[PDB]
Design an enzyme around this catalytic site. Structure first.
Site, PDB file in Angstrom:
ATOM      1  N   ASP B  51       0.838  -1.202   0.000  1.00  0.00           N
ATOM      2  CA  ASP B  51       0.000   0.000   0.000  1.00  0.00           C
ATOM      3  C   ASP B  51       0.877   1.258   0.000  1.00  0.00           C
ATOM      4  O   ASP B  51       1.581   1.520   0.973  1.00  0.00           O
ATOM      5  CB  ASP B  51      -0.962  -0.011   1.197  1.00  0.00           C
ATOM      6  CG  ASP B  51      -1.753   1.276   1.408  1.00  0.00           C
ATOM      7  OD1 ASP B  51      -1.998   1.995   0.413  1.00  0.00           O
ATOM      8  OD2 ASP B  51      -2.115   1.561   2.567  1.00  0.00           O
ATOM      9  N   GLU B 117      29.467  15.709   4.558  1.00  0.00           N
ATOM     10  CA  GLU B 117      30.098  15.659   5.871  1.00  0.00           C
ATOM     11  C   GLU B 117      28.926  15.463   6.828  1.00  0.00           C
ATOM     12  O   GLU B 117      28.144  16.387   7.045  1.00  0.00           O
ATOM     13  CB  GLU B 117      30.837  16.975   6.164  1.00  0.00           C
ATOM     14  CG  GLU B 117      31.888  17.333   5.125  1.00  0.00           C
ATOM     15  CD  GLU B 117      32.545  18.687   5.318  1.00  0.00           C
ATOM     16  OE1 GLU B 117      32.293  19.339   6.358  1.00  0.00           O
ATOM     17  OE2 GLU B 117      33.316  19.097   4.421  1.00  0.00           O
ATOM     18  N   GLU B 119      27.267  15.091  10.262  1.00  0.00           N
ATOM     19  CA  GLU B 119      27.361  15.343  11.698  1.00  0.00           C
ATOM     20  C   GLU B 119      26.164  14.696  12.400  1.00  0.00           C
ATOM     21  O   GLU B 119      25.069  14.646  11.848  1.00  0.00           O
ATOM     22  CB  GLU B 119      27.383  16.849  11.993  1.00  0.00           C
ATOM     23  CG  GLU B 119      28.665  17.532  11.550  1.00  0.00           C
ATOM     24  CD  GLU B 119      28.744  19.018  11.841  1.00  0.00           C
ATOM     25  OE1 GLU B 119      27.689  19.635  12.106  1.00  0.00           O
ATOM     26  OE2 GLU B 119      29.868  19.567  11.807  1.00  0.00           O
ATOM     27  N   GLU B 173      33.184  16.156  17.035  1.00  0.00           N
ATOM     28  CA  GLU B 173      32.856  17.533  16.651  1.00  0.00           C
ATOM     29  C   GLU B 173      32.899  18.504  17.860  1.00  0.00           C
ATOM     30  O   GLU B 173      33.299  18.098  18.945  1.00  0.00           O
ATOM     31  CB  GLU B 173      31.492  17.572  15.896  1.00  0.00           C
ATOM     32  CG  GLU B 173      31.591  17.851  14.404  1.00  0.00           C
ATOM     33  CD  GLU B 173      32.341  19.095  13.961  1.00  0.00           C
ATOM     34  OE1 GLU B 173      32.203  20.161  14.604  1.00  0.00           O
ATOM     35  OE2 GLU B 173      33.081  18.994  12.956  1.00  0.00           O
ATOM     36  N   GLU B 180      31.365  13.397  13.543  1.00  0.00           N
ATOM     37  CA  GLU B 180      31.250  13.626  12.108  1.00  0.00           C
ATOM     38  C   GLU B 180      31.941  12.501  11.359  1.00  0.00           C
ATOM     39  O   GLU B 180      33.021  12.070  11.752  1.00  0.00           O
ATOM     40  CB  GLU B 180      31.864  14.982  11.741  1.00  0.00           C
ATOM     41  CG  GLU B 180      31.593  15.462  10.330  1.00  0.00           C
ATOM     42  CD  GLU B 180      32.281  16.773   9.999  1.00  0.00           C
ATOM     43  OE1 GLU B 180      31.894  17.813  10.577  1.00  0.00           O
ATOM     44  OE2 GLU B 180      33.207  16.761   9.156  1.00  0.00           O
ATOM     45  N   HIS B 229      27.248  19.319   5.436  1.00  0.00           N
ATOM     46  CA  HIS B 229      27.949  20.130   4.446  1.00  0.00           C
ATOM     47  C   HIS B 229      28.154  19.268   3.225  1.00  0.00           C
ATOM     48  O   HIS B 229      28.753  18.206   3.330  1.00  0.00           O
ATOM     49  CB  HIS B 229      29.290  20.653   4.993  1.00  0.00           C
ATOM     50  CG  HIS B 229      29.175  21.348   6.316  1.00  0.00           C
ATOM     51  ND1 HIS B 229      27.966  21.880   6.755  1.00  0.00           N
ATOM     52  CD2 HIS B 229      30.093  21.528   7.285  1.00  0.00           C
ATOM     53  CE1 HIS B 229      28.201  22.380   7.954  1.00  0.00           C
ATOM     54  NE2 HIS B 229      29.465  22.222   8.299  1.00  0.00           N
ATOM     55  N   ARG B 300      36.745  31.511   4.871  1.00  0.00           N
ATOM     56  CA  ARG B 300      35.538  32.074   5.540  1.00  0.00           C
ATOM     57  C   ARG B 300      34.413  31.039   5.651  1.00  0.00           C
ATOM     58  O   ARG B 300      34.199  30.308   4.670  1.00  0.00           O
ATOM     59  CB  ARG B 300      35.049  33.306   4.771  1.00  0.00           C
ATOM     60  CG  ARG B 300      33.714  33.851   5.253  1.00  0.00           C
ATOM     61  CD  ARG B 300      33.880  34.841   6.390  1.00  0.00           C
ATOM     62  NE  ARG B 300      35.054  35.685   6.223  1.00  0.00           N
ATOM     63  CZ  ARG B 300      36.164  35.579   6.945  1.00  0.00           C
ATOM     64  NH1 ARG B 300      36.223  34.712   7.939  1.00  0.00           N
ATOM     65  NH2 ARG B 300      37.210  36.337   6.667  1.00  0.00           N
ATOM     66  N   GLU B 317      31.377  23.816  -1.429  1.00  0.00           N
ATOM     67  CA  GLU B 317      30.841  23.202  -0.226  1.00  0.00           C
ATOM     68  C   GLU B 317      29.599  23.980   0.207  1.00  0.00           C
ATOM     69  O   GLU B 317      29.715  25.092   0.713  1.00  0.00           O
ATOM     70  CB  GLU B 317      31.916  23.205   0.875  1.00  0.00           C
ATOM     71  CG  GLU B 317      31.580  22.362   2.095  1.00  0.00           C
ATOM     72  CD  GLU B 317      32.548  22.519   3.249  1.00  0.00           C
ATOM     73  OE1 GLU B 317      33.641  23.090   3.042  1.00  0.00           O
ATOM     74  OE2 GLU B 317      32.221  22.059   4.363  1.00  0.00           O
ATOM     75  N   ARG B 319      27.029  24.539   2.766  1.00  0.00           N
ATOM     76  CA  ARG B 319      26.979  24.242   4.198  1.00  0.00           C
ATOM     77  C   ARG B 319      25.634  24.474   4.886  1.00  0.00           C
ATOM     78  O   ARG B 319      25.535  24.193   6.079  1.00  0.00           O
ATOM     79  CB  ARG B 319      28.066  25.046   4.917  1.00  0.00           C
ATOM     80  CG  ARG B 319      29.446  24.911   4.247  1.00  0.00           C
ATOM     81  CD  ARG B 319      30.624  25.481   5.019  1.00  0.00           C
ATOM     82  NE  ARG B 319      30.232  26.624   5.853  1.00  0.00           N
ATOM     83  CZ  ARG B 319      30.092  26.624   7.178  1.00  0.00           C
ATOM     84  NH1 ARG B 319      30.381  25.538   7.890  1.00  0.00           N
ATOM     85  NH2 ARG B 319      29.689  27.722   7.807  1.00  0.00           N
TER      86      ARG B 319
HETATM   87 MG    MG Z   1      32.816  21.618   6.872  1.00  0.00          MG
HETATM   88 MG    MG Z   2      32.169  20.034  11.391  1.00  0.00          MG
END
Ligand code: MG
Ligand code: MG
Ligand code: ATP
Ligand code: ATP
Ligand code: MG
Lengths: 435, 428
Positions: B51, B117, B119, B173, B180, B229, B300, B317, B319
Site C-alpha cells: 500500500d 560531511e 554530523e 565535533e 562527524e 555540508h 571564511r 561546499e 553548508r
Molecule cells: Mg565543513
Molecule cells: Mg564540522
C-alpha cells in the site's frame, strides 16, 4: 484640601508605612516604601528615585496623586496599617517624564478633552488561579470547574468573595464575578469609568488578586495562555465616548440607533488594530491565545451582539451604548492599551474613516478562500509581526511618545530573539526518536 | 540476469533467510517490507505489492546493484524503486525524482558528484527511551578517554566498509557527544543511498550499545547543531566542469553560474535541505551553521565555500543543509537550481571575504546581503512560489512536502512551550 483629609485618615486608621506605587512600560507594579514621617515630603516636593526601572538621566521624582490614597485592608502587624498612593513620574526640574505610562494616557485624554470627548472603559478581567508546589507557582488549576459553575465545583468562591470585598473597601464598584470556561479560570467585570480611573483599578485588581491568592497558598495569573488546549484569559474592553455629558455613540434617528461617531471610532480602531495588538497583546504567549477554537477573536471584523467578532456592538442603547473590543489580554499595560485605542479611535472620528461591512456570519465556518474575496484580514500571528506593524504606525508612535514606543520595541524584540532561538520540548518529542 | 544469479550465490553462501525491501518516504525516513528468502525470486521478477500510502497499491522494484548482507541466520537489504501497478514509475518516489533530475543533467553531458560531511549526536537512554543527554563530554578532534564513542564510531565505519562504502575520515565535533563521518564523493544517487544507509547503521549500532544516535539539526540549545555540508562538483564528459586554469582563482564560468543558480533559489531549497521546525533553531548566529546568503573562498565560513584544492578536486561546499533532510530531494533541488544557473548564465553576487558575523547590519544592507528563512513556514512560502523546484521535484512530491511541513508548523505554532511559563507565569 485632599492632603488634610489624607493626614486625618493616617491618624484615624494608624497608618505607619505608605507605598508610592507606579508602573513600568510593561504594566508591572513598582513602588517605594516610605515611613509615614516622610508622607508630608512625598505630597510636597516629592521623593527622589532612580527611574532606570521605568524602562525595564537616572534621578527622577515621584508625585503622588492625592485622589488615589487608599488604606490596604490587610491590617499590618499589631494594629499598624499600610497605605498606597499611585504616583506620576516627573523629572528633577518639574516637567512630566514622557516615558511614564500613566502620563501617556493622561496626555491622550487631555487631547480628547480639547474636542469635548471623554472615554469610558469597563473591562472584563479574566484570570487563572493555580496551585503552588514547593513555594513555586505552577499552571495546575486549583478547581475543575467550567462556565458559570457553582461550589463545590468552583473551589475559589472564598478567595473571589475576598477579592471583591477588598476592592469595594478601596472605592471600587464591581458589576459581577463568575467562573469561566477553562479549569480554574474566573472573571471579574467592573463598571465603566474614565480611562485613567479604570487603568488605576486594573493595576489594583491584579495586585489584590495576586496578594490574596498567595495568602491561600495559590497563585493568580493574568497570563494570556497559561495552558495549551483550554480557553485563554482575555480583557474584553467595553468602550464608549462621551461628548458634552451625553453618550456620543447614541443617535436615536440613525439606523440601529448607532451614531456616526461610533462607526468612525470602529473604523479608526480597525485601521490600526494590527499595530494596537503589540500594546494590547504584548507577550510572546499572547499570540498562543489568538488562535481559532476559543472565545478570543483572531479575524479583523465588527458586528452586532449575535457574533463573536473583534469588535461587538451590544444591544443596550441610550447611555449604555458601547463597543466591546475583545482582542486585548489582561497582561497588557492598561495605561498604554487605552491610550492606543483612544488615539486610533479619535483618528477615525476626525478623518471620518468608514468601517468595513458588519460580518454577521460565523467567521470560523467561512472558508479561507472566501475571506480573501470579502477582504477579511487576520491579527498578527506572532509578537514580531505585531511589533513590525506597530513600528510603521506613525500615529500610535506619536500618541504614546518616542520614549515609550522605543521601550516597547526593545523589550519585545529582546523576548522574541530569546524565544526564537530556544529548542522547545515539542521539537524533541516530535523528532528526536525518528531523526 | 547475472546480477540476479550473483545475488542468489551470496544467499546460499551467507545463509540469508530474510530480505528487507527498503525504500524512503517524502521525509527521508526509511521504510521496508520484510520478506522470507523464498519470495526473493518474486521480488527480483514481477515485484512485491504493497500500500503506497506509506510514501506520503504500488509495486516494489529492487535495484540488484544495492543488494548487501547486513553484517549483524543472516539478513539482506535491497533499495527499491516504486512503480504503479501497470508499470510506469511513481513520480512521488523520492529516489525516482533524483534519478529524473540526473537523467536531465546527463542529456546535457553533466554528472553531479556529492561528498557529504555527516554530523550527528550520540545520546544516553533512560528507561529504554532516548534523551538529549550527551554520552561523552568531548570536543573538536578530541581523543579517548575524552571521546567515549570511539568504539561505536569504529564499528560504524567498519560495517559501512563491509557494504561497499569508502569512508574518508571520522572525528569528534565541537559539541558534547557530537561526531562527524565524512565519506568519499560519488554520483548523487549512490551518495543518497549511502546517506540513508549511514543513518540506519548508526542508529542500529547505537541501540546495541544502549545509546541513541540522532541526525536532528538542533537537539540541544546553546551548543553546536548537526549539519550536512555537501561538497558538490559537476563533470562534463569526464572532466571537472568547475576547473579553468586560466580564469581568476582557477574557477571556471560554470562554477560561478552554478553558484549563482543555487544562491538564487537558496531560500526555496532551504525548505528541502532544512525541512524540520527544529532545523531553523540550528540556523542561528554563533555556531558553524551559515545564516547569511554569501559565497567565499576557504578562509571564511559562508553558505557556499570554494575550497583551495584544484584540478579534478575543484568543488563547492554548500553548508546550509542539515542531516535530517531527504538526500534524494536535497541533491535534486541543488542540481536543478545549479543547472538553471549554468543554462541562464546567472552571475553570482560578489564574494564576501570579510567576517559577516562581525559586520554591522547597515554594512550588510549596503552589500545587499540576504538572510536564510527564519522559520519553516517562511521557507515553505518561498518554496511554494519557486516554479522551477516545484517542476523539478514534481507536483506530487512538492505538495506532500508542503502538507507535512504545514501540519507540523500549525501544531507547533499553537503550542504553549515551557519557555513562556518560565518567562511570564510568576510575573503576570
Ligand atoms: Mg565543513
Ligand atoms: Mg564540522
Ligand atoms: N457606557 C459605557 N462605556 C463603557 N463601558 C460600559 C458602559 N456601560 C457599561 N459598560 C461596561 O459593560 C459591562 C456591563 O454593562 P452593563 O449592561 O452592566 O451596563 P449598565 O446596565 O448601564 O450598568 P453599568 O453602567 O454599571 O455597567 C460593565 O462591566 C461596564 O463596565
Ligand atoms: N569532485 C568532488 N566533488 C565533491 N566532493 C569531492 C570531490 N572531490 C573530493 N570530494 C570530497 O572531499 C573529501 C576529501 O577531500 P579532498 O577533495 O581534498 O581529497 P580528494 O583526493 O581530492 O578526493 P577523495 O578524498 O575523494 O579522493 C572526500 O570525502 C570527498 O567526498
Ligand atoms: Mg463578554
Amino acid at each position: 484640601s485632599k492632603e488634610d483629609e489624607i493626614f486625618r485618615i493616617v491618624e484615624e486608621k494608624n497608618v505607619r508605612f505608605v507605598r508610592l506605587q507606579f508602573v513600568d512600560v510593561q504594566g508591572i507594579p513598582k513602588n517605594v516604601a516610605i515611613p509615614v514621617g516622610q508622607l508630608e515630603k512625598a505630597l510636597g516636593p516629592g521623593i527622589h528615585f532612580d527611574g532606570s526601572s521605568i524602562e525595564g538621566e537616572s534621578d527622577m521624582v515621584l508625585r503622588p496623586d492625592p485622589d488615589t490614597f487608599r488604606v490596604l485592608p490587610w491590617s499590618g502587624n499589631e494594629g499598624t496599617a499600610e497605605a498606597r498612593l499611585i504616583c506620576d513620574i516627573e523629572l528633577p526640574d518639574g516637567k512630566p517624564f514622557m516615558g511614564c505610562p500613566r502620563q501617556v494616557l493622561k496626555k491622550n485624554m487631555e487631547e480628547a478633552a480639547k474636542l469635548g470627548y471623554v472615554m469610558n472603559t469597563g473591562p472584563e478581567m479574566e484570570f487563572f488561579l493555580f496551585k503552588r508546589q514547593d513555594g513555586m507557582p505552577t499552571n495546575i488549576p486549583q478547581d475543575r470547574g467550567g462556565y458559570f459553575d457553582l461550589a463545590p465545583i468552583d473551589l475559589a468562591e472564598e478567595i473571589k468573595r475576598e477579592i471583591v470585598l477588598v476592592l469595594e473597601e478601596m472605592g471600587f464598584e464591581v458589576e459581577a464575578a463568575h467562573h469561566e470556561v477553562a479549569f480554574g479560570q474566573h472573571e471579574i467585570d467592573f463598571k465603566y469609568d474614565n480611562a485613567l480611573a479604570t487603568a488605576d483599578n486594573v493595576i489594583t485588581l491584579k495586585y489584590v488578586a495576586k496578594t490574596l491568592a498567595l495568602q491561600h497558598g495559590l497563585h493568580a495569573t493574568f497570563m494570556p495562555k497559561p495552558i495549551f488546549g483550554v480557553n485563554g484569559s482575555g480583557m474584553h474592553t467595553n468602550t464608549s465616548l462621551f461628548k458634552d455629558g451625553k453618550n456620543a455613540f447614541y443617535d436615536p434617528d440613525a439606523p440601529d440607533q448607532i451614531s456616526d461617531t461610533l462607526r468612525y471610532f470602529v473604523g479608526g480602531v480597525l485601521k490600526h488594530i494590527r499595530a494596537i495588538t503589540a500594546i494590547t497583546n504584548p507577550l510572546v504567549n499572547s499570540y498562543k491565545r489568538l488562535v481559532p477554537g476559543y472565545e478570543a477573536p483572531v479575524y479583523i471584523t465588527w458586528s452586532g451582539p449575535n457574533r463573536s467578532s473583534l469588535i461587538r456592538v451590544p444591544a443596550p442603547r441610550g447611555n449604555s451604548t458601547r463597543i466591546e473590543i475583545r482582542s486585548p489580554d489582561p497582561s497588557c499595560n492598561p495605561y498604554l492599551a487605552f491610550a492606543a485605542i483612544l488615539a486610533a479611535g479619535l483618528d477615525g472620528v476626525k478623518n471620518k474613516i468608514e468601517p468595513p461591512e458588519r460580518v454577521e456570519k460565523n467567521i470560523y465556518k467561512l472558508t479561507e478562500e472566501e475571506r480573501e474575496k470579502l477582504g477579511i484580514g487576520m491579527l498578527p500571528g506572532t509578537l514580531k509581526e505585531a511589533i513590525e506593524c506597530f513600528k510603521e504606525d506613525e500615529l500610535l508612535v506619536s500618541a504614546l511618545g518616542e520614549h515609550v514606543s522605543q521601550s516597547i520595541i526593545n523589550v519585545a524584540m529582546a523576548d522574541w530573539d530569546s524565544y526564537r532561538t530556544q529548542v522547545h520540548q515539542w521539537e524533541l518529542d516530535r523528532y528526536l526518536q525518528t531523526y
